[PDB]
Amino acid sequence: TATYAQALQSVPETQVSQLDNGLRVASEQSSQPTCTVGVWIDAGSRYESEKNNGAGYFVEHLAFKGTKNRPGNALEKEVESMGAHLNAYSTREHTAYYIKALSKDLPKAVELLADIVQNCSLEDSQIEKERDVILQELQENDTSMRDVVFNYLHATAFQGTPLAQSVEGPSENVRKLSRADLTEYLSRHYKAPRMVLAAAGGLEHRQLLDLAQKHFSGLTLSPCRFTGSQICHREDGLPLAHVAIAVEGPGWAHPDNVALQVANAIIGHYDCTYGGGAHLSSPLASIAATNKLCQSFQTFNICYADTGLLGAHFVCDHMSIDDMMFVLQGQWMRLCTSATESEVLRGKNLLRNALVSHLDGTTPVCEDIGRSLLTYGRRIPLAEWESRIAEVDARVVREVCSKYFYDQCPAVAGFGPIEQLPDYNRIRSGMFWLRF
Amino acid sequence: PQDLEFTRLPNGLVIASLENYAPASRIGLFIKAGSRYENSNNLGTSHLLRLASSLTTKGASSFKITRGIEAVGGKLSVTSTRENMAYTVECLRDDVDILMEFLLNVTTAPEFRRWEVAALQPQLRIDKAVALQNPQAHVIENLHAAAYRNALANSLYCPDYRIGKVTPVELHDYVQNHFTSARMALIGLGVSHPVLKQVAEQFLNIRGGLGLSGAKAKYHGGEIREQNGDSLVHAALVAESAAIGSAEANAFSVLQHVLGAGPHVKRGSNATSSLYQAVAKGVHQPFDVSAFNASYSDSGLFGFYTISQAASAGDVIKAAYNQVKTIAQGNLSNPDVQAAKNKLKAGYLMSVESSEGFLDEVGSQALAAGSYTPPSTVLQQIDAVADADVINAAKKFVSGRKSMAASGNLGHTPFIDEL
């Protein structure tokens, strides 16, 4: 049978392999008829230059538009032949091509996925088809208040580093961008060790590694500054006013990365539409549900290579914005002093819950494996997670959060009707209790 | 490990279970009472009933629940459709029993306190609003209203004049009428059969009474048009397909994947879909076309839901529509048939793999059939689809009465007589 500790123990473990030129391989076997095959590259925006800015997201489109051996829309008709779905997506630190398909068709799968990574037909017929689509998306992307307001947040905190910039880059580059830079950008960042292959499904390791297949792969971080600042785009038309507040935090591999995972579970999150009511446990989900001080808010946690961001994101009506900010800083400050053993548990449990339920399904597993290798190295420390959790103790939390919260310089970014959002020197004077 | 063990009771409530290796352990409970069981004066009840899961049980205060579940770190869900409401609940390997304890009390031992009902009233509007931001929602709910008379046309949401009209009695009656031990199905996943098998027989045995089937839905013609300021027309065009559990109900599923286009390649305009391609050649700038198929117990509908601009709307429909006639004229390609069936097998298997996704399809058979069908059987049933059958089936769509709904600027919209 299965007991909580026992259920950790029987899982197909990570497999690893090398090729000669620095490509990597890895996999797992779920005894399942379907499989995810993918590729995860570390070539990001924070590498790209000021002229190359946006090229990455630009390239991201062209790959499926036809390639060296299989011209335009000959490629797709083979994917739709298998009936396999096909996907790609980007991120500031990563880029991912992957396929969900039956275990059977895998022989073509890689050999297809192989080609797309490197050989790409680049035809200015496609470019002008593309250069519109982007100049179509940029102007629209104003329509989503969320995605915007983040692009405020980075630029305001990180100003003066390659990390401080948009993914897609300013519009003007989209016009001027010529496939010369692309080929250069292609040439630079797509070699191994950068590249990583992964997969999970009915695949066995060795039946992969042979058809890891006779193909080929290929032949920098500097730390970033933290600028305590503010930005306000004040626009009084719109009905509601977003806010985001954040403080800087550690990178991927680091012990404190776990402690803070738990805190932001405890403060919890509320939304308009929950069935919670006024009886919820999360002290901001009880209060802000009572009077609907804010329509909804979630806490986010983002960790880059050497750096991470902590903070929340909340929407509320303009007369109400003050009262969030206070009641917020109540929470962070009651943690760093007055926290308690009991309340820890309800935080601790949820993390065990979400961590595990995050592993259902083929792709979410595989997707994890991809970033992990680039991140922590090979480590997929599943059962170890639990072992790392029991580290967490009362004195653990209050020693951790005393670092990053108490008496710091926040980063505020907001989007109108911001007007009531207090002037900066209030917030800074609201981070540190005077004991009241 | 072990495969599906489903056990009738004398009571008639199906139970089934597996034993997993995972710390993931989840339970589900399905009931036959959906929207189709709301009556004229009875409207809007189900859509309230679905929000009340946190109210005070018979034995436990509404407070002790909500703090209780979260302390464990559990999660409770609710789901409805036009047919089967399902209370889903999930937690860690260990703690299920405390949580298995609450699941009953909610559905077994309700109490509706008039002062705890009235406070919840305003919630509906907040709920109803965020639902209709996607008009692709709001188009559908009109559609059923056009294509029926009595039952299925009912909304999944509460009409507005009906808001202050929900009395506890109405609830407390609709509880016991359409809840009964014949109509319910309890499905575990990671838990041993006997533990599950024990408690269910105890609490969930009530009556009798059952099942009030008087809805034949009586497919009947009609159409609905609506004029709003939005600049993008939506359109649906539907004729009556056949009921679930038929090679036809299988055949239509074959037919869609021929025409029916979900994106299989991100940003890729689907060239394998004859429909979206057959249009784009003779037409202009953005639009979208997709086939639409859904099947219920006594009947199911088939059609295609389109989006365009105000000018093109007239042509887009006529273009796509005649394209179907081509197929009804005998034009066919066996490879596409062979290709489509592959997509179907693909679309189905990848759909099932996820536990939750798997969990739903389990009981979906249960309340309908009462058995389990291994996916292999599905597969072998898939390829049984004949070519002329597909054609002949599509010959029914064109040859039979149709219905429509449209929301947006209608200036150029055709009517069902011009088609």
Partner: peptide
């Protein structure tokens, strides 16, 4: 034309906000 994974739509409300579907 969206059922798209499965039959018609859904409504789900628990905690986590709400979910529509096709």
């Amino acid at each position: 034309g969206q059922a798209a994974g499965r039959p018609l739509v859904a409504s789900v409300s628990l905690n986590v906000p709400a979910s529509v579907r096709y």
